[model samples]
Target chain A: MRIPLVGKDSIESKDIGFTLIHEHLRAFSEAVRQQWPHLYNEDEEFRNAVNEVKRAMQFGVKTIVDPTVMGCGRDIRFMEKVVKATGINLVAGTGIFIFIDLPFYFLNRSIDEIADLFIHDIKEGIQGTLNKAGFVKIAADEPGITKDVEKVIRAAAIANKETKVPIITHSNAHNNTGLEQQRILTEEGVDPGKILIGHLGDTDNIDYIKKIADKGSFIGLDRYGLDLFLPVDKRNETTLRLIKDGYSDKIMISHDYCCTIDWGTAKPEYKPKLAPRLSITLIFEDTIPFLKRNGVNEEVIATIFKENPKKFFS
Target chain B: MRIPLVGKDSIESKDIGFTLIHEHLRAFSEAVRQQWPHLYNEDEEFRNAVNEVKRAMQFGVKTIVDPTVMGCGRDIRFMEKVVKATGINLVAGTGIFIFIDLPFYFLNRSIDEIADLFIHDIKEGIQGTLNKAGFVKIAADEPGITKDVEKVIRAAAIANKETKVPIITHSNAHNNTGLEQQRILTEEGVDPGKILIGHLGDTDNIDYIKKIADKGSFIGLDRYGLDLFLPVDKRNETTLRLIKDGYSDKIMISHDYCCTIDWGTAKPEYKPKLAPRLSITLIFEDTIPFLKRNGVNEEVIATIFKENPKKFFS
Candidate 1:
């Protein structure tokens, strides 16, 4: 149980305790900000950040890892606001997002070059950025790695090797990515145990959930409350399958709710009437209640919500 | 180009074919059939088959592979009706589904033994009833295969190796399954070319799709009409990406529609609105239109629609 404390603020290990593997402080809405200027104001952003931190703290979530990399639209000012407002230890992540929908400027860079850039960002600093990321974010695909994704991961691995900062991949929620991530990171001598594979719970397969754990890595059941993508029944079934499969220790759950952009150039009409409370229900209403109904004792729930998170924050 | 003739009347390949990879004969209603005994009558079944076949012929579909396996509720009687009605070649599949979804009878079986059963079913026949399957079906997950999934795949691979029947897998919209299928099956001594890595079009990830094609296997962009799962724009984007990557030859497209439940377990919710049409439009409307819009020549479309299917049938 080792949680890499990759944030600016450190809650003494005992005091810090449980953690949120990856979280954000601001909503990622470029259009909304353009349409409604007040939404982007520091006062409102700070308020939203405080509200999220308060809600997380109520769940006894002591530590929060904010790996809002450059592409995830991370706002360090918002992170600082939330940390001060909630009095919770916040660990920021440092790494680039292998943005599929990014402008040509992002895609043009080579992975080796990206690695150099990330290394500089981690070591020297991210060009006068607000808060430095403590961990790293990377991605992978079939055939070992997607051309662009490989660059980000290679860069992340280099950055992690340099700083011992752990990595969390923005994987294409497939088993092969997990396997391939192992091959690439391990080849670079990055400890597989330190990395967290995100979007694992996207499918309804238990063996898949276990496979990540078996790879000596952590599994992020990140899509905790997106019922539109997968209904609650399927989600509960997967959770039960994992618990029954005996992977309780290696399992971590979170809602990768990018309250970022509801809609924009990423193709319009994708915006849905999802309530802001979707993130709240991911842990409270949906995942917790679902686990309870499936006979997952409160202690085990505490582990997923508390102990398991600390494992990553250690 | 090899086009296998697959219908109750004939199981031999014929020339001059534009096969409908995704086609359904009947719009099954679970409740009505259960309450009304006559609903199971051959006339109704034959009528549905005739209507589907007539539409295919009208739309210029020649050779069709109806992958209605045991999991999809196998029915040779329906295949017979389809043959008698349309006479368009229809290839039926023989294989089990994912382990968790397997029937009680198959839950405890080992992969080696499951392979034997699949081989036996292919040879001696399925459960002392039904027609000899013309093709094989299998599925794997995103993270990778489970021990059970690995076993089932081994069974399917062995069956394919022994029977020389090509294996078409339900790759669930990710190319990793196809890639993993290649690795595991190759380890099991099954040629990569023998598998159709199904469902590549559901995602807009072309590098993954092309890598599978580069390995000299088949790529099934088989979920042509399942725009609801992803989106119409995304689906077209993937198709164009496949063409741009120069993989039109090793590709196959189909809408993965099915009579999801058994004829006996009639349910209304299971019924679909636009599920009536052939899945070809996922290619014709979304994919091909995108290709033409991008100035892809007609020769390319004919190759994917005509030449690729012809070669794959061999």
Candidate 2:
């Protein structure tokens, strides 16, 4: 199986090795950027992204998947430039990122209408480029599964069903809404095998982790370096236990690292300290070693990062 | 009083002659434009704007006030370039322009929080430049005054009270919503003297026009060449009756001519025919002559175009 890259490009899923499932190259408010572009410098941003991708590449990360969509200011052209500069395979998603309410553009659109747009990005192109999205991204946060959030999940389900691309979510681990998300996606007839419920690592509740893992969907203990930080030990311990319990096949890992993000900052150009050091390399330089020390072998590391994502894509 | 123009520039209200009270320079969705800029040509759009401004200048349009704001994709620096290129005074605005629902950014925000943003745009530079907005813009369309719509109106009222910049609106005349907007604004302690109830020309209900004009704000018969079908007679007669009924002081006019807008188009690069012939010079090339032949004098035209806006801003 092959997954789409930027600009009608594709890479065989088998070649996507040591992949980071959730990362962002850029995160900006679309309205703010277009209104006050002075606060941002795209050339500086892309250059910064290139340096970061190179850092991850040195750590043997062959791929980085970005979930940025319309509300998050996803720029596929920017991504293409970064990919051109570095040969690292980048897979971008198609969907909205609203937590509570849909943006004004999507407020009145029906679920099918919204799903049609996601499907269009998969088949036609994303944002007018042949850079088709490789997956569907949606969010359900502390506000829980509000009407708009549910609408996005269902819409993503339809897109996933049609395209066979995987669905990755930004779910609230605090509320364990990842289960709610899986409930909705599976109810919408999306294969559980194709949905990755993200942000489950922030919890120490093994029951919560076990429940989602048992559901036959990939559980992203993806925020390894983040500051929901179960203080590193608990997060790794949770992952170690999940693998020991024989759910290694369902586990996916990444730092949810963003190389360049301008949200919640004093200005778009200024680096944000809101969530410090979302280092994508940490999954390799830090987490992989930690897992190996805990008797999680290299074969399993390769399985989770390389084969798990490969199988998930298939 | 001096009114602010694009980017730290200000012109005395007395110098503003033959003004268009309601107009837009550009109206592309910010998300769409930023995501799919290939659909837009900023260079071509600006060149087209320069030509239109030059034509309006020939017809004695000294200053054109744009009600474009956050939700309408207000670009202050873009306006600054147009002003510099064509030497036309383009007054920009601040405030959100959602017709019924608040955008995701403003959905959870309180009225004061939203108004604080409007106040910031008027005081601080709009978008980022020292180019401040001269007025606040809000809207209530066929959905009538929903809760979100009323929230915007009150927010605009507070911003108006603080900034002393007049408030311009996009109201639905079909539902007599301009009067409803007037009711909300005045209730929020907005001086009706500083409000302009736009789109009143479309209504045949002379009493409705009289009622809003009777209260102190200006009424916009703007939308002149707009295939508003306005057979030209009914629209001219409405203005004629308003003037004959001693409400000339309350009437304002413009073609609602946007020199460059990319909404309601097949693509942003292509021009829109959604609202045809919004010729800024139509006030001079067309509407004014018809009004003069229908027993309107130049002094009355000057009063509406010159004295009315100046007095409203003051």
Candidate 3:
């Protein structure tokens, strides 16, 4: 099968089936527990993730992407366990998070050297890790992606230049991240089609999304569980508005769940009442209703559920 | 009965001779060991630090500050042992690093609530810690100081506000960190003269240092061991020029060291180095020689060695 130079391995353009772009599974926050052991909580991570996954699957989510990278924390074994239990396609990642900068190696490492590491993880399996890696994870905050990001973008573009795994990024609320991504991609000569600018739900400005979308990149409204900060309805309305404007092919939805499985105690932040209602069914259970109420036809919903995700994942 | 806000302290300045603004005797890169055990080594951390400290003491250095905060993998007991071994007037601290965005207990903490913790540590003892309570340690970095830093700054300010202890900050090289210090000072109205901005050497900008110093803040040339990124000569030149320029009262020197007792096979990055030599003797051993070579008069040298730091640390 002939593959596009940049997006060869990407899922078919119209096959974005019931997808959950961001969600947790039985996992421990390795980063948190390491730095603050007093704050690590294992049981809570499992319980909450288990419940959330069940809800997601019930909602008809056939595929779930847990792009939690090295720093944000990633657990392949736990993810596999959750996938087996929920029978959902759980796609993990191979990359670094923005906040996970190591001043030592990074300062000394050449871009090629860093890219080689990424290639090793993707092709040879993440060294010392038992999990299968999928996609590339990168992050950029204010002041734009640092020289480190620039290096990683070049490395990832080179490593996956042939494979074409889409790169997922965690951008802060502001729109500089998209520009940062564009700059990196343009500089590296990578196509925008292989990029996903996350955290779109965190902002409502359509023009911002349109700038990247116009570049043929995907935008994810991935902050679902953060209803208190930005009401779920408002988040949905913004997303639906994007879709209503014929931007449906570029949108995704999921709850960014941060469960701690290492603390051994429940998080003070995890209020039992406000806990993420676990289970894939919540999408069908909650989201579909909103879509229907908003006059979203089943055909468009079907495309969002099936065809759109295939474009990125298949 | 009068208390010094920023510049003066109850401690006799001359007695505070040979002060090491930053130094540690512990290793905290356990994660790296788990990832690359064979490549890990810890002996470098201790031998290098001890040699450096001993070398420095030969020159007349008497005190050292080791801001080994909780999250930077600090082990206070180990620090105490090193102090007992070296007899370097070791001043420890209780603070969090900038990178780890700790839970809300750290963030939402009121200034009073946080200040009480610092007071309790110094007055009674660290609640669950092994060694004596620290003098004071504070950290703030880019992307805004963690909410923890705010509470910490407030708490330390209040504690210093009440008991008049010295508080040091881990300021990043970026421009905002200085502004951040300014903001915190504005809020707490603590005397900037009391707080030391650690790691100014790595910041690589003289104007930035002068700006902060102009505000009565102490600038620390702390990261001394790793001269590969920024050479020792450059550091010496910068300090000498600054002192020559009449900003000597705003500058202090330290070796930011992180050490663990066992020196068990650990990551290479955590290994100790002959470093920001902790002993004051070495300060004259190296710096004085350089000064002599540069035609510095005995009076000027004595003022730097005997008067300036005394005034700053006093």
Candidate 4:
């Protein structure tokens, strides 16, 4: 089966080698930009994005899947330009992120309607571009199952049901909201294997992480560089522990790094200070070496970066 | 036909009398509130809302249909409380508003999936309340027919097709985007009569206003006190001209007033200063009297306020 790459033609899932199952090229709220246009430097941001994708290429990261949907300020046209500039394979996502609150557009809508929107992005082109989204992205956070969050989750499940597209989630690692998301998606008849329980790298609870992987879903240790959520040692220890326990096949790794993300108030200069490892090259520069030093073999690393991601998409 | 009321059971369409068809009980953004919690005051806002409703009741306004769906922050539970306090009939809306950008959740969804959400809101309870939305509300602003806006318009049209609920829109009256909206909704097979082309009063162009009404859709002279958009004289002039041109039965009056809206930085108290007549009582306290003085007689007022809205919902 072919995997959809935003702004580019589809490629075979197996050919999508050394893929980052979760990452962001851009993540900012559209409304925030309109309300405060001064925060964005579009030209600089685009150049930065191109450079970021090019940087990832040096690490043998051949593909990057961006789940920057509506809440995350998805701009396929911008991404198409980035793809053209860097020549890095990119899979864009459909769906919403509601770790805070649901978008007003989604407040009164039902689960099925939201699902249809996701299906459109997967089957059809996104933002009038030739590229289509390869998967669905929904989120559940500390405010578990707020009226709108549940709606998004169920909508994603239905989209998955109709399209057979994979579902990736931004879950609260501490609250085990990934389990809650899994429960809802499973109840809606989505195959557990088709879902990637994202943000699992933020937690070191082996029992919690194992429970997610045991359900046949891909476990995303995707937040590799952001040590603010969990220290590098803990992430390394938990990842090595999980790999030792023979769950390497379900493990996928990537940094949820974005080239440009304006969180309304946070200055771009403050990001490195806020998250010391918040860079696209963090995995290649630091995490991989840290993992190797901590006794995580290259085979397990290969499974996470290449084999596991290919299997997840396939 | 039955008109669904917030916090209460559905009532016969005829029972909806002297209605303001395009008011917003609350027009705040949920994500905005979450991002800036200090900007909102729920208890004070609730009290203000109750008082606003009661004030409208004093002028014989019996019913108000709030087109505050997802984008405008439709909180049915909060409205239910205001309903209980005021005893004024309120009908809620489903669908989405897309004046800025589409919600992140809808970035990759299909039109059918979006329609299902609207259908659910019409058929099922809204926000866990007994209230179901009786109408669909969508928007088309200056950046007309944007990818997201068109997606939302098509979604609302499909929702109308499924549920037979009336469609209301927040359109850029200056750009005559109401006509653009009508074109799309009609193409989707929604009876033009089933739509309320909201914000028409914001334009003084009698030709454009009449054109929308001629298509059998109700022309909403809804922005009663929003002088900032277009002055009261223009709103009244356009409304009166449309009425004289035999569109009385298709004219509806309202104020797109919200009890609480935090425009990120603006304090709630500064609302009056921002849009002097932005109060909910503007229609009842000022516009109605102004219309009465301007040859818009009691019969025409009755047609616009009571008869037209009831027929639209029916």
Candidate 5:
């Protein structure tokens, strides 16, 4: 099976090397940018993103799956520019961000109708481009699976079922909605193996992490540098524990980092002052090294960084 | 005109004395609660909310308009208990919160169908109660007035047009979305005079605040104690400046305080350590007195606290 690219065509899953399961090229609401154009510098942001992706490439990162769907402002046109500039493979997502309410466009629509939209993005293209989505991304964060949110998750499941693409999700590990996501997806006949329960790194609960993995879904130890939610050491320790417990194949490591985040621009002092390790290269610069140092083993690291993600789509 | 209470009957708009225009009784997603019951404390939250309302009443706060609609988890069933215990007049909102995307139930629905729901809340009742919403509450925050957000704003305007209910909006002052909201509402033939541009207190930009006020809409200095965003001193100074600039009649004051927020629970150290002035009584306990001390006389204070809100729903 081939993994899709946003601007370009699809590549074989084997070519998807050192893949970060969840990341964003341009993560923001377009409407926000239109009103306050000065808040973002597209040209500068694009340049910064290009550099970041290329920098990650130097650390053996090849493919990135950016699940920046409707709510988070997925722009294939802009994303197209990044891949062209950086020569890194990108898999755009086809689904909505479930952090907030469903966008008005999908609000009153039935599950089938919502599923059709998701399928359309996957089969046809996203944002008026020929760039097909490689996977279906859905989220259930602070709100968990409200009736509407459930509708979204279920619709995404249907889309995943129809498209046969891997289903990746943004879940609040603290709230333990990953299980609920699995329950819904499983009830809808989605194979648990197809789902990657994201943001597992945000919590230190090993039992909770194990529960998700035990059910056969991949757990994304994403958000590596976001220490405010969960520190790097705790995240690393949990990953090592999970791997040691024989869940290495069911684990994926990544930084839920974005090239251009909505938190204003990338200032010189922002890195050291506010976010000490909020780099797109955190997995390569910090996480991978930490895992190796802690005897996570190179084979397990390869499986997490590459082999598992390949099988997720395959 | 009657101001409605959740799970109760409507009262006269004039009875909504010293009202806080934007506040929440219980702001959370229901789905998040079900997955992890410990994340939220419903019983303790309800009791705390009752005390807060009574406490606000003791400080001469007679009414509060909760704009916690679909996204913020508006639950009239619980809100009913708070009003019954506190005996404070409460007006609930009809429209959806725009902080997130439109809920999936609303995603595919026509703008008219969405408006119908808001109208039902205004004309019939909210969440299976006889209480009608006194005002329509919509929002356009960080992701200011995106296509979906605009759809909500327009639909809310349509509801207001049909119901003749006042409209209150959540706007990003920093992004100047108040003007964007006003522009859409005005385009939809909503009487600008019947609108409240919320969270103007978040920014100290006199000119931005004036632009919304000049359009004949009320500017909300609702977030008085949210110093993390804009300090109390800055918020108060901005409100004072607006009042001095002859926008007193076009101004409204409130805390935007919540009884049960998704911030874990009601810890003792939360208030004093984190949000010192984040109380239901801040408008009464401190802001009012500070304004009075700063030469913002009784007449003007009454206009802001009492008269303007009265006119908003009149």
Candidate 6:
């Protein structure tokens, strides 16, 4: 299987190496920049993104999947520039990223119609760019499976069915919506193995984590460094337990980091400091060392990095 | 009193001619335009806005107030371009325009903080341009005076008291929230005279409207041709009733016209058809003719068109 890169290029699945399955290069309120372009320095933004990706790339992280879609400032051209500059694989994402209201474009659209749009992106191209989306993303936050959210999720299911592209999701795993998501996706006749339920690391409940993995879907022990959710020890403890139980094929790792974000750009005082532990190198430099010391074998880690993502995509 | 035009110029209250107190040159989903600017033609949009303004300007409409504020694609630069090209008075509006949720900028802000932003725009300039906002706008739609809505109403009231600029609003009069808005504004120390309760044309219950006008605020007999809300005959009947009751000074007339709107631009099929009566010239070419034929004296019409808006701003 060949995965489409953001810069109108493609790579064979076997060549994919040390893939960070979920991260964002840039996230913004798209309207803010247009309204106040003075607040943004384009050169600095691209440069920072390039710098972040290269820092991770030097650790053999060759590919990164950016699940930043419509509502979260998914710009295809920007992704292309960052990847080209840093020479990393960036799989662009498609589908609306809303918890409640769909944009006016999709507000009144039928599920089939939305599926057709997403399917087109995965096969044709993303929004007039010749670069096709490598996967479709849908999210269910604290709002649960709202009508609009469910519609996108089901739409993504239909799109995945047609295009054979895998599904990545933003789930409130702590809230147990990951199982509900699995129920809906499989009920739509989608294979559970083809769906990756993300943010499972948000909870330390091994029972909740096991429930998702047992259902044959990949559990994203993503968000490795954010202690606000759970401490690194708790995250690794769950990962080690899952690995020891032999669910390595159903595991994937990521930092969910953003190289550039306009979240607090509106208020100068509000630019949230990236805490010392919250770096793209968190998993490579820290988590891996900790996991290695805890006796998680190297071969199992390779299975997660290369084999799992390629198998899911294939 | 002098009102600032969108082009950084001002006109004396006495010189302000037949004015449309509520209208928009361009309305868009700011984020949509930023993401898919290819959907827009800047030249065509500006040309259409210029054409709309010039059409009304030729009919003795010397001044126009654009209440398209934040959350509704209020662009100071866009308004400035339209007014400069047509040489018409365009009073740029400042305030958030939402029926329910406020934007991220004002989402977590206090009433005082939001008021300071609006007050700054009124006294200084909008965004970064030197063109000052002539009036502060806030809204309460069918959702009624929600927490966010009430906060903005109070904020606008505070701004109104501080800057002495008139307050324009989008209200759901049918829902009786207009009175509730008045209660809040007045409670915040805003004189009813400085507030314009807009969209009263959405209802034709004469007593309901009379109840508002009797409180001393200007009642917007705006949305003249949107028969989807009420027929022209019904709107005229209410206007005549208000006039006969000697409340003409408290009435303002406008069509709530939009020269260009991206509301339906996402889908070509959804580009709403402007009914023949929905033009910017409807008040001049249709409503006034209907009123004149029905014994509304020219003096009463002049008070609605010329005096009421000037008095509110002054």
* lDDT, candidates in the order shown: 0.61, 0.79, 0.60, 0.77, 0.77, 0.79
- How does residue B130 of candidate 5 score in lDDT? 73
Ranking by TM-score: 6, 2, 3, 4, 5, 1
Q: Which model, 4 or 6, shows the larger TM-score? A: 6
Model 2: residue A151 alpha-carbon error in angstroms: 6.8
Question: RMSD for each model, in Å, please?
Answer: 21.9, 6.6, 8.8, 20.0, 19.2, 4.1
Docking tier of model 5: it is: incorrect
CA error at residue B309 for candidate 3, angstroms: 10
Candidate 1 at residue B227, lDDT?
37
> Chain B TM-score for each model?
0.79, 0.92, 0.75, 0.92, 0.92, 0.93
Per-residue alpha-carbon lDDT of candidate 6 for residues B162-279, written as tens digits (9 for 90 to 100): 8788888888867988888888888889999998898998787889888888988888888974544776667878887778788888889888877876543233222244444577
Please compute DockQ, using alpha carbons, for every candidate against the native two-chain complex: 0.01, 0.22, 0.06, 0.04, 0.02, 0.27
**lDDT of model 2 at position A172:** 83
**Can you give the TM-score per candidate against the true fold?**
0.44, 0.73, 0.65, 0.55, 0.54, 0.88
Say which prediction, candidate 1 or candidate 4, comes out ahead on DockQ.
4
Top candidate on TM-score is: 6
| Complex DockQ, candidate 2 | 0.22
Give lDDT tens digits, candidate 1, residues A159-267: 8887776788756554477667766887888887778887777776667667778978888777664443455557768877788667778787777654333222322
lDDT of 3 by residue, A1-314 (tens): 21111111334434445777776553333333443344445556666676777766665666677776654456566666666666656667777665435433344457776666566556555435544456778777654666666676677777657566677777875647766776677567667767777887787777887777777877877777544345566677787888789987777666665543232233345443554453434456566688888888887777665666666654
The better candidate by DockQ, 1 or 5, is 5
What DockQ does candidate 4 score?
Answer: 0.04
Q: Count the backbone clashes (under 3 Å) in each candidate.
A: 23, 2, 72, 17, 17, 0
Q: Write the per-residue lDDT of candidate 2 for residues B88-203, one digit (tens) a residue.
A: 88888887776656554453458897788788778887776788888888888877888988888889989988888888888888887899888888998999989889888887
Model 1's alpha-carbon lDDT is: 0.61
Ten consecutive residues with minimal summed lDDT in candidate 6 chain B? B264-273
